[PDB]
């Protein structure tokens, strides 16, 4: 049975991280492979040690025995992706169960916007409102929805982004829904912001139709 | 350029078969072996099987009751076809290859990946809405603007903006499910506040199971 360890990391750039695979035989050459968030599974070491083509230098694949590591020498933002190692054994291909690499960075503060719903989805039945936090780590954070004052809860949902690519920064929405009744019938509507980069909770408001 | 282009996203009824084909163009690939890779959500990699165009085949144990490859010479197409369908049948289905070439060169490609989705429910596109903006999206000489994609299913939607031409500043979320049981997403993207008298903005919605594309210009409101 294959296994490979761990399951997740965080790391700063320019950081060595270290991947390992322990294999049930050594007959067969071992295989790793970068998947990022969306994005098929790509290919950057072939026979345990050879770089795939256009790879940067800084991946390296070595084996001993039934025990085989994966290092990236110097992490850099792009890297954040999950990892798997790959090998034939017994007449199928096994990959790895996954190593999800994260980076650990400085604090940096969410820029906050909101958004009334549209004129089309409003006067068709129901009201989305929309908070958009941009562009900030770590990756906790809390929203609050206000409308006339009042706390917000049941109907709302958030999603967040994978770690960025180029600056390791997270980015969060989150969608206030209302019917067009309930919607039209308040004033005041507002997003409260609590991050770590914030040195007091920020608003965000509009008041409808102006 | 080599690629591997796979057929749409589809919703299939439980108990239902459906057939994810892979086109290959920019190289022979007569005489290699066309590898089928599952990925449920969330979850790691599982090998399916290996096609032999020049025409035999082999199976991981698992996948033999469940699944059958073919190919058709003439078109460049591996086809891959799940029978019997179940909840636990849903995930990315993946083509790829792995091999030398005649020039000794090593080569690893993969197509983009098909989900199928399991469900009795039926297919919807999805509204979307614009994400206007004002005054309270200006933050410090930048705007940001997006648009709201609402009450489609399955999963997945892909968003471009002015059809590939803007790329810096983009965020498409990850879609919540809704207590309709409907998928929503947002898609924003941060612009010069300077740009919104002049510049167009229009998001590109792809919905392939229902076989639909929406295009959204987002304009300052009057």
């Known amino acids: 049975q294959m296994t490979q360890s761990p399951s997740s990391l965080s790391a700063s750039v320019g950081d060595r991280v270290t991947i390992t695979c322990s294999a049930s035989?050594?007959?067969?050459?071992m295989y790793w492979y970068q998947q990022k968030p969306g994005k098929a599974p790509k290919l950057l070491i072939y026979?345990?040690?050879n770089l795939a083509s256009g790879v940067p230098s800084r991946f390296s694949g070595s084996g001993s025995g039934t025990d085989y590591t994966f290092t990236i020498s110097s992490l850099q933002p792009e890297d954040i992706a999950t990892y798997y190692c790959?090998?034939?054994?017994?007449?199928?291909?096994?990959f790895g169960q996954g190593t999800k690499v994260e980076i650990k960075r400085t604090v940096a503060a969410p820029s906050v916007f909101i958004f009334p719903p549209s004129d089309e989805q409003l006067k068709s039945g129901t009201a989305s409102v929309v908070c958009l936090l941009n562009n900030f780590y770590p990756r906790e954070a809390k929203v609050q929805w206000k409308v006339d004052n009042a706390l917000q809860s049941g109907n709302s949902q958030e999603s967040v982004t994978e770690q960025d690519s180029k600056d390791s920064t997270y980015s969060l929405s989150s969608t206030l829904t209302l019917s067009k009744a309930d919607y039209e019938k308040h004033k005041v509507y507002a997003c409260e912001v609590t991050h770590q980069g914030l040195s007091s909770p920020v608003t965000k408001s509009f008041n409808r139709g102006e | 350029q080599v690629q591997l282009v796979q057929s749409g996203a589809e919703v299939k009824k439980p108990g239902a078969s459906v057939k994810v084909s892979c086109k290959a163009s920019?190289?022979?690939?007569?005489?290699?072996?066309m590898h089928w890779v599952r990925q449920a959500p969330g979850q790691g990699l599982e090998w399916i099987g290996e096609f032999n165009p020049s025409g035999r085949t082999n199976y991981n144990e698992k996948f033999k009751s469940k699944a059958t490859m073919t190919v058709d010479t003439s078109t460049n197409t591996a086809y891959m076809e799940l029978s019997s369908l179940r909840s636990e049948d849903t995930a990315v289905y993946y083509c790829?290859?792995?091999?030398?070439?005649?020039?000794?060169?090593?080569?690893?490609?993969w197509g983009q990946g098909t989900l199928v989705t399991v469900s009795s429910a039926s297919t919807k596109g999805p509204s979307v809405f614009p994400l206007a903006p004002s005054s309270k999206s200006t933050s410090g000489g930048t705007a940001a603007l997006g648009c709201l994609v609402k009450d489609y299913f399955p999963e997945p939607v892909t968003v471009s903006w002015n059809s590939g031409a803007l790329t810096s500043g983009v965020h498409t979320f990850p879609a919540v499910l809704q207590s309709s049981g409907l998928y929503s997403l947002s898609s924003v993207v941060t612009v010069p506040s300077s740009s919104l008298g002049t510049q167009t903005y229009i998001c590109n919605v792809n919905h392939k199971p229902s076989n639909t594309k929406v295009d959204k210009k987002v304009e300052p409101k009057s």
């Open positions: 035989s050594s007959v067969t050459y």
């Open positions: 790959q090998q034939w054994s017994s007449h199928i291909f096994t």
């Open positions: 920019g190289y022979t690939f007569t005489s290699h072996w």
């Open positions: 026979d345990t040690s």
């Open positions: 790829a290859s792995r091999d030398y070439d005649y020039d000794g060169r090593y080569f690893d490609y």
